[PDB]
C-alpha cells in the first residue's frame, strides 16, 4: 500500500550539493538571529536534528523566538481556502538570513538621502520606482556600417 | 372623456395556457409551471409555448386602463358609486353582478347625474 | 454577456427602517432621518442607524456604566445619549447629576438619575436641545456579554463552552475532557 512517512519523496531535496558534502563551514554558526528577522528555510541533510519538514523547503518566514541551538519561525501555510499560522522550531543550519528585503532597506536609505539633498536644494524629487519605459527616438549612422543583405539558405544535410 | 394617456401597449395579448392543457382533459388551461427534469418547456426549446416572466409587465402609465382609458371600479349601490364623484376622468363604475334589476335603474340614474361612466349599463335592462 | 466580477442584485445588508412596528419608534425615525438629511452633523447619522438596531444589538446601558463615562477628564458636563434602555445599578453608591437621553429608563434607573437631581430626556427632547448633537456622549452596551455568545465558535482547543442542559460532574466532563480518560479536548 501507499507510503506517506515524514521524509518520503525527499530524495534529491535533502541531497548534499555535488562536491559540497561533509562538515558545515563555521560561518553558519557564527551568524546571529533576532526576533523579527526574515529567514529562508532550506534543509541540510547532514543535520538530522531540528530539521524542517519538506513542505517548508524553499519557504520564507519570520523569527518569533530565539533559543540555544535554534530559532522559531512562523510561516503562513495555506490549507483549504485559508491561511493558518505555522510555528517552526529549526536549528540554525537549516535557516539563512534573507536578502528578500535588502533592496528595500537599501532603497529606503538611499531615498532618505535623495529627499534631504532635494529639500536642501529645492523640491524636485521623484523617488517612486517606475517600469521599463519604451525607447526614445534615435539616429543610427550608416558610416562605417553599411547594411549587409541576408537571404534564407538552401536545404543541406551534412550527416 | 378620459384623462389623456400614452398609447396603450399590451405586449403579449395571447393567454398563457398550461403545457398539455390541450393534450388531456384532466389538465386545466390555468397557468402552472413545469418542474420536470427533462421537460422541453421548462428548458425553453425552440418551438414550444412561452412562459410568463416579468419582462412582459405592462407600462406603469397605462397599466390597469381599459380601452376607454378609465380604470374600472366595482359598485354595489349609490354610496359606492358616489365615491367616484370627483374622479370621472379616471375611474368608471362597473355594477356588481349580484345587484338587483330595480336597483340598477337607480345607480344608472345617479351615474348620469354625476357624469360617472358605467361599464355595463345594459345589464338586467327590461326592454 | 458580461464576465461579472461581482455578485449581481445584492442587497446592501444593512437595515433601512427598524423591523419594529411601534408608532412611537417610527416617529423618532421620522424625526432623525430628517435631521440626518439636513444637518450634516455626523451624530444624527449614527443615531438614525441605531434606532434600526434589533434588541440584541442594543444591550442595556447600566446606570453605573453611565457614571463611569463622566469620569473621563473633560467629559463631566456632557449629556449622555443611550439609544436603547437604561438600567439601574445597585452597586454604585454615588451617582452624579447630569442628563440622560434614552429610549427607555427602568423605574429604578430613572429614579436614581432623578434623585441626584439629574434629568431623563426622550430623544426628541434631546433633538430640540441639540440638533447637531452638541455636547453629547453616546454610550453603547456590552454586546458580547450575552449568553449565546459563549457557545459560538465551539470546537477542539477553543475554550468555548458546550451547549448543554443539565450540568455538574458526569455531564460531558470525561473522555476528551481530561488526560486520564482518552485525551483532553
Amino acid at each position: 500500500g501507499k507510503s506517506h512517512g515524514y521524509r518520503s519523496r525527499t530524495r534529491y531535496m535533502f541531497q548534499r550539493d555535488f562536491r559540497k558534502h561533509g562538515a558545515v563551514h563555521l560561518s553558519t554558526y557564527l551568524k546571529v538571529y533576532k526576533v523579527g528577522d526574515i529567514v529562508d528555510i532550506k534543509a541540510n541533510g547532514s543535520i538530522q536534528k531540528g530539521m524542517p519538514h519538506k513542505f517548508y523547503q524553499g519557504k520564507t518566514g519570520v523569527v518569533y523566538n530565539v533559543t540555544k541551538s535554534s530559532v522559531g519561525v512562523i510561516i503562513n501555510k495555506m490549507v483549504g481556502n485559508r491561511y493558518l499560522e505555522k510555528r517552526l522550531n529549526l536549528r540554525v543550519e537549516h535557516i539563512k538570513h534573507s536578502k528578500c528585503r535588502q533592496e528595500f532597506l537599501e532603497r529606503v536609505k538611499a531615498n532618505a538621502a535623495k529627499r534631504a539633498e532635494a529639500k536642501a536644494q529645492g523640491v524636485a524629487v521623484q523617488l517612486k520606482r517606475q517600469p521599463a519605459q519604451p525607447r526614445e527616438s534615435r539616429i543610427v549612422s550608416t558610416e562605417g556600417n553599411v547594411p549587409q543583405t541576408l537571404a534564407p539558405v538552401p536545404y543541406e544535410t551534412f550527416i | 372623456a378620459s384623462l389623456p394617456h400614452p398609447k396603450i401597449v399590451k405586449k403579449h395579448t395571447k393567454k398563457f395556457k398550461r403545457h398539455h392543457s390541450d393534450r388531456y382533459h384532466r389538465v386545466a388551461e390555468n397557468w402552472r409551471k413545469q418542474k420536470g427534469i427533462d421537460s422541453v418547456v421548462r428548458r425553453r426549446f425552440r418551438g414550444n409555448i412561452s412562459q410568463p416572466k416579468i419582462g412582459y409587465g405592462s407600462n406603469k402609465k397605462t397599466k390597469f386602463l381599459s380601452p376607454s382609458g378609465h380604470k374600472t371600479f366595482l359598485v354595489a349601490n349609490v354610496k359606492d358609486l358616489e365615491t367616484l364623484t370627483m374622479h370621472t376622468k379616471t375611474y368608471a363604475a362597473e355594477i356588481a353582478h349580484n345587484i338587483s334589476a330595480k336597483n340598477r335603474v337607480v345607480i344608472l340614474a345617479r351615474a348620469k347625474a354625476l357624469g360617472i361612466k358605467v361599464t355595463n349599463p345594459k345589464g338586467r335592462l327590461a326592454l | 454577456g458580461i464576465d461579472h466580477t461581482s455578485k449581481q442584485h445584492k442587497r446592501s445588508g444593512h437595515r433601512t427602517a427598524p423591523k419594529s412596528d411601534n408608532v412611537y419608534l417610527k416617529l423618532l425615525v421620522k424625526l432623525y432621518t430628517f435631521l440626518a438629511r439636513r444637518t450634516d452633523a455626523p451624530f444624527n447619522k449614527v443615531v438614525l442607524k441605531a434606532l434600526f438596531l434589533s434588541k440584541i444589538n442594543r444591550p442595556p446601558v447600566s446606570v453605573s456604566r453611565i457614571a463611569r463615562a463622566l469620569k473621563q477628564e473633560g467629559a463631566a458636563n456632557k449629556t449622555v445619549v443611550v439609544v436603547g434602555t437604561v438600567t439601574d445599578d445597585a452597586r454604585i453608591f454615588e451617582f452624579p447629576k447630569t442628563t440622560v437621553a434614552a429610549l427607555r429608563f427602568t423605574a429604578g434607573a430613572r429614579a436614581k438619575i432623578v434623585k441626584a437631581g439629574g434629568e431623563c430626556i426622550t430623544l426628541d427632547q434631546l433633538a430640540v436641545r441639540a440638533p447637531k448633537g452638541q455636547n453629547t456622549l453616546i454610550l453603547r452596551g456590552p454586546r458580547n456579554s450575552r449568553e449565546a455568545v459563549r457557545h459560538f465558535g465551539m470546537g477542539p482547543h477553543k475554550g468555548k463552552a458546550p451547549r448543554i442542559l443539565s450540568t455538574g460532574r458526569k455531564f460531558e466532563r470525561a473522555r476528551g475532557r481530561r488526560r486520564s480518560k482518552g485525551f483532553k479536548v
Partner: protein, 222 residues
C-alpha cells in the same frame, strides 16, 4: 432678493471666461500637435540626407478591443481582461505601454485586438462614445463642466483637455483614463476583413497587435 439677472450675470460672465480659457488651450494643442508631427517628418528626411536612419520612439500608448466573447476563457487571461476593464465583447480601453503592461497585453493576445490610435480616432472615440464614471453611474460627457467638476484638480477643464491628456500620455494619464468608462463599440461595419478572427493578425486573423491598422478597425466599430 435680487438674483434675477443679478447672479445670472455673475454666472454667465464667469461662464464666458472658462470658454475663453478653453479656446486658447485648444488653439495651443493644435499648434503642439502639428509641429510635433512636422518635426518627425523632417527628422526622417534629414536623416536620409545624412545617409542615416531615423528610428521613432516606440509607441507609449495603445488601444485594446476585446474581440472574444465571455465563455471558455482560462483563468489567468481572464483576470487580466478584468483588470484592463474589458468584460464584454467589442468594448475597449486605452493602455499606457510599459514593461508591466506590455506583459499583460502578452497574456491576452488571443482574446483581443489592439494597436496605436491616431489623434483622429481618439478624438472621435471620446466625442461620440465617451462617458465618465461619477459615483459610478456612467455619465455621458456632453458638457465640459462635467469634466472640470471631476477632473478639474488635475488641470483638464474641457473634453479636449481630456483628449490631450490621453494622447500625450500626460502626468495624470491614470486618473484621466480611469475616468472614462470602457468604450462600448459595435461590430465593424465593413466586417472583420478576415475569414476567421481567432488567428493572430500576422497569420491572416484578427488578434494581437495590428499596430496602426487598429484605426481602420475601431473607426468601423465606432
Amino acid at each position: 432678493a435680487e438674483q434675477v439677472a443679478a447672479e445670472r450675470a455673475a454666472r454667465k460672465a464667469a461662464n464666458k471666461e472658462k470658454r475663453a480659457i478653453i479656446l486658447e488651450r485648444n488653439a495651443a494643442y493644435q499648434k503642439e500637435y502639428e509641429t510635433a508631427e512636422r518635426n518627425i517628418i523632417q527628422a526622417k528626411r534629414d536623416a536620409k540626407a545624412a545617409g542615416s536612419y531615423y528610428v521613432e520612439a516606440q509607441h507609449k500608448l495603445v488601444f485594446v478591443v476585446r474581440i472574444k466573447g465571455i465563455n471558455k476563457i482560462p483563468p489567468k487571461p481572464r483576470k487580466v481582461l478584468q483588470l484592463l476593464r474589458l468584460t464584454r465583447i467589442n468594448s475597449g480601453t486605452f493602455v499606457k505601454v510599459t514593461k508591466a503592461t506590455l506583459e499583460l497585453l502578452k497574456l491576452i493576445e488571443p482574446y483581443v485586438a489592439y494597436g496605436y490610435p491616431s489623434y483622429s480616432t481618439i478624438r472621435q472615440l471620446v466625442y461620440k462614445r465617451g462617458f465618465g464614471k461619477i459615483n459610478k453611474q456612467r455619465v455621458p460627457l456632453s458638457d465640459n463642466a462635467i469634466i472640470e467638476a471631476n477632473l478639474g484638480k488635475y488641470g483638464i477643464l474641457s473634453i479636449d483637455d481630456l483628449i490631450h491628456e490621453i494622447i500625450t500620455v500626460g502626468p495624470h494619464f491614470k486618473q484621466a483614463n480611469n475616468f472614462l468608462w470602457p468604450f462600448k463599440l459595435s461590430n465593424p461595419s465593413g466586417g472583420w476583413g478576415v475569414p476567421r478572427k481567432f488567428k493572430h493578425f500576422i497569420q491572416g486573423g484578427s488578434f494581437g497587435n495590428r499596430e496602426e491598422f487598429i484605426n481602420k478597425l475601431v473607426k468601423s466599430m465606432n
